[PDB]
């Protein structure tokens, strides 16, 4: 509902999740989904500490 200002960018730690990246990525609302060192379709075939 309300993101933090640019200069004071908030952070949140994500842990023990199951990340359904593919269902998020294929959504139409994201105007851009650039990724670096990783590809979006592969994201489910991965797991990051």
């Amino acid at each position: 509902t309300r993101f933090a200002s640019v200069y004071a960018w908030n952070r949140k730690r994500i842990s023990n999740c199951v990340a359904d990246y593919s269902v998020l990525y294929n959504s139409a609302s994201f105007s851009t989904f650039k990724c670096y060192g990783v590809s979006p379709t592969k994201l489910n075939d991965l797991c990051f500490t």
Partner: protein
């Protein structure tokens, strides 16, 4: 021959040189030469084909 150390230094040198070259060769396999990662499985699981 029994007592003196390094009596066979030349054969030892040959073996050491060969083993050292192989050890370097396998070690180089760990370096990524600027790539994203040094494991092909990691790259293939992480990145799209192109």
């Amino acid at each position: 021959l029994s007592s003196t150390a390094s009596a066979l230094g030349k054969l030892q040198d040959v073996v050491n040189q060969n083993a050292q070259a192989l050890n370097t060769l396998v070690k180089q396999l760990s370096s990524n030469f600027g790539a994203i990662s040094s494991v092909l499985n990691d790259i293939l699981a992480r990145l799209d084909p192109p």
